[PDB]
Symmetry: D2
Subunit: 233 residues, 4 copies
């Protein structure tokens, strides 16, 4: 039977490119969305036209709250209901905006930036593991140690996601679940800037990590940034 | 006039050693505590007996909630109310317990582990920096800094401690992000990262010795004073160009392979 | 035509598996060796039996010395002589043994451990770049920051190789050359190591309690040289089963 | 009795400030130098005027070669001959210049890798064999965002991080701590135009200035002190936040 994958924030941009490549590789896909229902269904339509009944959508707000654990349980359950299995979880959904230290309430910003970027991946990881070539791929940040000015909460959530990638790789290794990261990265600064950055390049690294060609790789974060993290101020 | 410091979780153990050494160095100190009221008051009493009116206590829960920003503002405000200034913030308080991925509510665990280790340090950092805006300038003798208590083992985490390790990773992120953003205000932001220091009071001696035997330098845990020494260096004039640095105080533990 | 690759220390073990997988992917290969002449020639024979004129051997000592630049130049020149091009360089050859701080001359140990692990990759990188989907892959070590006791010079060499990987990625990007690393943890154990000691190392690995096969290491090299990694440069991929994440 | 320290490349700039601060803390010092004899002797004379018989000089080339192990043994021996003990070794001497990928290259290898990595290793060996003991290595906070065309220098500083960690592990049972101090931008070249110096200064978040040599020395003094007794294998950045700044 065909393996199945959940991709969060899959309606647009990087998540969409990842869902497309997984589907092209032979996966059935759950396309998670929060607000982008039209785009999520448009993508499912396109994938189902290629292979009938191989793409479904799942709505969830990934902001931290009292109901986030049940929402994340539901996303994983939707994979099992549609496809009878869940082989791959891609934690792609992300919020991104500045939160200056010196001057939405700040606690709403915490619930969004830390909740979407770190807590929902944690809850999804728990639900994926509890329900069990299995693997999880977290979308990290190549610039995590040279943060953007005034992005403290965003940077904290991306740091927490490194910690989850490493902790979950160690704890889920006995279950045969690998846990890795892809870290995307102005153009004139990128060493490989002759090539334009694309969502498909990020998806290519995800496809490698979920493949049999990465069966010994766990706890690894692959930077896909054209060399930008190497460039000094 | 003597400078003033806030130390979170300062009633006992490492936070107390930090408060004691700051006080011996000449600081007035706010001893924040959550549940350890008797121990906090006992410490404040000892410090005030050494020099009158140089220590106060401040009670707060640092679990995340919609009131946490007000709590953290109030901790900083307590320093200014007692002492008229706040030169140093030490983010020491920390919840620590396992949260296995495979089997309190999990949302309570998130609020405790991520709140104490990361969100409260972030809000305290916001409040510390914001309160400096009103102060008179001291362009000649000002030495403002924040020290976060990190973990030397953050990249070799303990089994089944994902939320704890996520919170400590976020604290590294805060340390570096706040160092960049607050440098223009002359506020330095650094970390001290213990490996094995004081073992839990409830841990059996056999288990404590298992941890001690891992440490290359002396096969023993760091004393609380050894952790405090690195905090004292980072707040001192001898560290005036250091910002965004995390000093491991771990006896070589993080260098040891499986 | 078919692209061409140099793999150093390719007669046996991980370098052999890399040369084989590059050849299976469509590369012509230079099999570099130092002492393993019979194994190198046998491998070239096997690869040429599959596709004629797609494999050659090249012999060189990669110990540092005043002739090392000439040797490294000649390895790259051997790829151009055989195949007319050189698209990929894999720096795999490596000396590995203890050099305790407290008690071969020590200068010979320096020349061997720092030469093979760092200086030869640097000179090979210079000659590869000068002679021009181009890329270099360096075989690093996932344990570089939790080093084996009494392996100072080896560990220094591997740290220097990380610096080279990053510095050359930065400097050679304008020429379209990507430079990345693959960092094994425990892969193929030494032939001379007893079974009990091998099992000790295997038991450390979270993912499967086993060493990486040479083929698993080669799979990461194949990815990095591929069109699916064209925006990756300066990255070191650990292939370690989670070993580097395990505390004391 | 007073402890003793060897500082390499101690005639000028950061090494000089280290040697002065160690001497002010109460150490007797061996001032190693390569070409700067007049400045090394001037420093020793200044320190001996302050307290008699507390400073000597030791000349050596720290380029890698057949004779480097004997040179490094002789530097450590000079401390024992003058002062009867050697408590601290500071590996500060360093060659620094570009080596573009696209002097012979093997001379550049010998100089850049010898001064930054091989000589620290051999000095570490001789220091340990001869035994609050500690070694401090002068690292580089920018080691993972290197300057364009400085591959050999960067390789040498990466190797020095590996030495700092390997030696901390191996020498811990002997009670010898091994740590690093990693400057970002500190003293710029005297000949560098102020317009270029200002380009570097403006990069630094904390004060838009370079570190003084004395600020680097303050971190060394901490690491050799009793206040760092449990610290080994640590590298302390003294960089004003520079390493945290993205391109
Ligand atoms: N773009 C880059 O260059 C870059 C750089 C570094 C890292 N990354 C990482 O790569 C991943 C994808 O990047 P991207 O630019 O494609 O992401 P993006 O478009 O900024 O957002 C990704 C998706 O996350 C979902 N999302 C946002 N807030 C949410 C919430 N509160 N609850 C539920 N879903 C929410 C959105 O889904 P709906 O639209 O359905 O609401 C959105 O489509 C992210 O993890 C990002 O951090 C990207
Ligand atoms: N001990 C070690 O070996 C070690 C190792 C690595 C890192 N560290 C770090 O070093 C620091 C000091 O360690 P430690 O062992 O001394 O810490 P600890 O005893 O475990 O905790 C310090 C204090 O944290 C306060 N705290 C806990 N939950 C709280 C909450 N919800 N609200 C407010 N305060 C709360 C407690 O205050 P009350 O007692 O008043 O309730 C407690 O006394 C911590 O950040 C720790 O993570 C320590
Ligand atoms: N095996 C592991 O578990 C492991 C772990 C971490 C990293 N690695 C890295 O992965 C790579 C492959 O490892 P491996 O175990 O397959 O390597 P290996 O068998 O120890 O050595 C590979 C080859 O290096 C060549 N070599 C040694 N000294 C040389 C010299 N002076 N001049 C020229 N060539 C020389 C030898 O060639 P001849 O046989 O032709 O003389 C040898 O066959 C190495 O870079 C290694 O550091 C391996
Ligand atoms: N300056 C900075 O901004 C900066 C930044 C990052 C890291 N660092 C590190 O901090 C340390 C001190 O920096 P610095 O700028 O003061 O260094 P420096 O002036 O460039 O060099 C220090 C001394 O190294 C000695 N040296 C050079 N080549 C030598 C050789 N072949 N043999 C023996 N000694 C040799 C020279 O001694 P003689 O003059 O006696 O010949 C020189 O005075 C160095 O390790 C450096 O890499 C400095
Ligand atoms: C249900 O509760 C449990 O299961 C306990 C048993 C498992 N624990 C440890 O393995 C463990 C591992 C390392 C430790 N330390 C090196 C000491 C220690 C002691 N107190 C601490 N307190 C805080 N806040 N943070 C720390 N990192 C910390 N660390 C301590 C305990 C502690 C929690
Ligand atoms: C002359 O004496 C020797 O060669 C020593 C090297 C092997 N020893 C090990 O403890 C040891 C530790 C870890 C090992 N591995 C994880 C396997 C391994 C096997 N071959 C290798 N080859 C190279 N080049 N580099 C490596 N990192 C490497 N690694 C192997 C041996 C002790 C004996
Ligand atoms: C052809 O020769 C050249 O092109 C020279 C001019 C180019 N250089 C610099 O731009 C440069 C960049 C940064 C610098 N610093 C941050 C100051 C500095 C000054 N002296 C040093 N000395 C050593 N040993 N190590 C250092 N890192 C060091 N660093 C200094 C010069 C140095 C070599």
């Amino acid at each position: 039977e065909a393996p199945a994958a959940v991709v969060t924030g899959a309606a647009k941009r990087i998540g969409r490119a990842i869902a497309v490549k997984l589907h092209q590789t032979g996966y059935r896909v759950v396309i998670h969305y929060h607000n982008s229902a039209e785009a999520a269904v448009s993508l499912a339509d396109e994938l189902n036209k290629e292979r009938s009944n191989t793409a479904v959508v799942c709505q969830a707000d990934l902001t931290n709250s009292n109901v986030l654990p049940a929402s994340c349980e539901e996303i994983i359950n939707s994979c099992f209901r549609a496809f009878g299995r869940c082989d791959v979880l891609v934690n792609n959904a992300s919020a991104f905006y500045p939160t200056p230290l010196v001057q939405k309430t700040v606690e709403t910003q915490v619930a969004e930036l830390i909740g979407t970027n770190a807590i929902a991946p944690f809850l999804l990881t728990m639900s994926f593991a509890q329900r069990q070539n299995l693997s999880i791929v977290n979308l990290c940040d190549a610039m995590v140690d040279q943060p953007c000015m005034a992005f403290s909460l965003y940077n904290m959530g991306k740091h927490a996601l490194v910690g989850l990638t490493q902790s979950a790789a160690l704890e889920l290794a006995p279950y045969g679940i690998r846990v890795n990261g892809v870290a995307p990265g102005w153009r004139r600064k990128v060493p490989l800037g002759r090539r334009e950055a694309s969502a498909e390049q990020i998806a290519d690294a995800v496809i490698f990590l979920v493949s049999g060609s990465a069966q010994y790789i766990t706890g690894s974060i692959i930077k896909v940034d054209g060399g930008l993290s190497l460039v000094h101020a």
